[PDB]
Structure 1
Amino acid sequence: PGSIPLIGERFPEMEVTTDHGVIKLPDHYVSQGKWFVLFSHPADFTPVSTTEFVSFARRYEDFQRLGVDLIGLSVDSVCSHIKWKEWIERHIGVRIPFPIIADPQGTVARRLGLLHAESATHTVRGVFIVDARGVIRTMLYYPMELGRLVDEILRIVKALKLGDSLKRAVPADWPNNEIIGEGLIVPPPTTEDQARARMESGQYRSLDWWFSWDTPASRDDVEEARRYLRRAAEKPAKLLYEEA
């Protein structure tokens, strides 16, 4: 096994070198009132990693609408990062606008547990979702051989921010949940007195005293979440390889 930071912990304090300059994490993003998604890839000039950078870049505006910044990470150095970006700009027609951390001695990698048994030398496809307080909200470890579904990363941040802003929990497969649809869950009672007050209140649709929900998300909130999933499910209109 290996060590990791945990959901509910402050992202560990660290200075990192990127292709945009030196930055402190998580302070650089807190100070801007921004969430960030830190994600890792094994090495520059690798194909699955290249497809993921293009996916993130296509979705950069959707992340900006949510007040979310993107930052990559591999063990390759800054000049390799910049050459790889230039190659993607020239050959695929896509500009990567977000920084990439250079982590040559694996210092960041070992701190975030991004070195798995699949490779002693190269990080797996780690994803840290960090809110504007610098708190880790969600962690995903995908392997070398499988690209990420970047639309699920938008769904996660949109639903987490909706949860925070309405004091609600978010049901499976939201906003297309099979029980309550675009409904959001009221945090259950934690005492018998709260359980009673809730059974007697009639304020919410309920299946039991522990399962109440309402529909407090705006139609804009619901449809933007659904658009991410519709894009994931859509056959692309024109493949970028064709005009390359």
Structure 2
Amino acid sequence: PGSIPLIGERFPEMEVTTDHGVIKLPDHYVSQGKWFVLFSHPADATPVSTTEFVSFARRYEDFQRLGVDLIGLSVDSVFSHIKWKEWIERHIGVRIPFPIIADPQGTVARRLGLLHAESATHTVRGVFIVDARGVIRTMLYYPMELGRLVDEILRIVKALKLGDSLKRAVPADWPNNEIIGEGLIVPPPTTEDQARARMESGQYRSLDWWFSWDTPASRDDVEEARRYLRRAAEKPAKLLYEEA
């Protein structure tokens, strides 16, 4: 087993070296009121890791529309990071606009619990979704052999921001939930008096005193979230390897 930071904790205070410079996390993004997704990959100049960097780069403007910055992490040097980004731009025609943390002694990897039993030396494919107060909101741990689904990361941020802005919880598979569709959920009553008030009010659609919802998301918010999943589900019009 291994120690990790937890959902609802402030992201561990640390200075990190990137291919853009030295920064403090989460302060660098908090002090900008920006969410960030910190993700890790095992090594530069590996193929699954390259596909994921191109996937994130292709979605960079979608992340910017949500006010989310991206930051990568591997045990490779800053020199490896610059050479690999140059390789991606020259061979795939895709610019990588976001920084990568260089973590050669595993100081950062050990602090974030990113060294699992699959490799003694290379981080797994971890994802830390961190809000503008620097709070960890979600964490994903994919293995070496499996690329992430980057549109799910966009859906998670979009849904968490919608939840925060509307005081709602977000049903499974939102905005295509099989029970309530694009509905959002009202946090259940936690007292007898709240439960009776909920039942006596006709404000919401309800299945029971503990299961109320409404549709307070804009059509734009719902369709933007659905577009992430539609993109995930679509066969590419043209494969980048062909025009490489």
Tell me the TM-score range normalised by the shorter chain.
Answer: over 0.9
Give deviations 1:2-58, integer Å, cap 9, x for gaps. Answer: 000000000000000000000000000011110000000000000000000000000
Give deviations 1:117-166, integer Å, cap 9, x for gaps. Answer: 00000000000000000000000000000000000000000000000000
Q: Which secondary structure does the structure 1 equivalent of 2:10 belong to?
A: coil
The alpha carbon displacement at 1:184 in A equals 0.1
Q: Which secondary structure does the structure 2 equivalent of 1:57 belong to?
A: helix
2:236 and 2:132 map into 1 onto residues whose CA distance is: 33
The alpha carbon displacement at 1:101 in A equals 0.1
2:2 and 2:32 map into 1 onto residues whose CA distance is: 32
The alpha carbon displacement at 1:89 in A equals 0.3
Q: Which secondary structure does the structure 1 equivalent of 2:239 belong to?
A: coil
1:219 and 1:243 map into 2 onto residues whose CA distance is: 36
2:113 and 2:140 map into 1 onto residues whose CA distance is: 11
What is residue 229 of structure 1 aligned with on the other side?
Answer: 229
2:198 and 2:78 map into 1 onto residues whose CA distance is: 57
2:87 and 2:105 map into 1 onto residues whose CA distance is: 25
Q: Which secondary structure does the structure 1 equivalent of 2:81 belong to?
A: helix
Q: Structure 2: where are the runs of 5+ without partners?
A: none
Q: Which secondary structure does the structure 2 equivalent of 1:220 belong to?
A: helix
What aligned pairs does 1:157-176 form with structure 2 within 5 A after superposition? Answer: 157-176=157-176
1:217 and 1:197 map into 2 onto residues whose CA distance is: 24
1:46 and 1:99 map into 2 onto residues whose CA distance is: 17
What aligned pairs does 1:44-193 form with structure 2 within 5 A after superposition? Answer: 44-193=44-193
1:33 and 1:13 map into 2 onto residues whose CA distance is: 16
TM value normalised by structure 2: 1.00
1:32 and 1:67 map into 2 onto residues whose CA distance is: 10
Q: Which secondary structure does the structure 1 equivalent of 2:118 belong to?
A: coil
- Among the aligned pairs, what percent are the same residue? 99
The alpha carbon displacement at 1:80 in A equals 0.5
Q: Which secondary structure does the structure 2 equivalent of 1:238 belong to?
A: coil
Q: Which secondary structure does the structure 1 equivalent of 2:24 belong to?
A: strand
Give deviations 1:166-204, integer Å, cap 9, x for gaps. Answer: 000000000000000000000000101100000000100
What aligned pairs does 1:201-216 form with structure 2 within 5 A after superposition? Answer: 201-216=201-216
Q: Which secondary structure does the structure 1 equivalent of 2:69 belong to?
A: strand
The alpha carbon displacement at 1:99 in A equals 0.1
Cα RMSD (Å): 0.3
Give deviations 1:48-89, integer Å, cap 9, x for gaps. Answer: 000000000000000000000000000000000000000000
2:202 and 2:195 map into 1 onto residues whose CA distance is: 12
What is residue 30 of structure 1 aligned with on the other side?
Answer: 30
2:239 and 2:145 map into 1 onto residues whose CA distance is: 21
Q: Which secondary structure does the structure 2 equivalent of 1:137 belong to?
A: strand
1:243 and 1:194 map into 2 onto residues whose CA distance is: 60
2:241 and 2:91 map into 1 onto residues whose CA distance is: 9
What is residue 242 of structure 1 aligned with on the other side?
Answer: 242
2:8 and 2:97 map into 1 onto residues whose CA distance is: 29
Q: Which secondary structure does the structure 2 equivalent of 1:193 belong to?
A: helix
TM value normalised by structure 1: 1.00
Q: Which secondary structure does the structure 1 equivalent of 2:141 belong to?
A: strand
Q: Structure 1: where are the runs of 5+ without partners?
A: none
Q: Which secondary structure does the structure 2 equivalent of 1:22 belong to?
A: strand
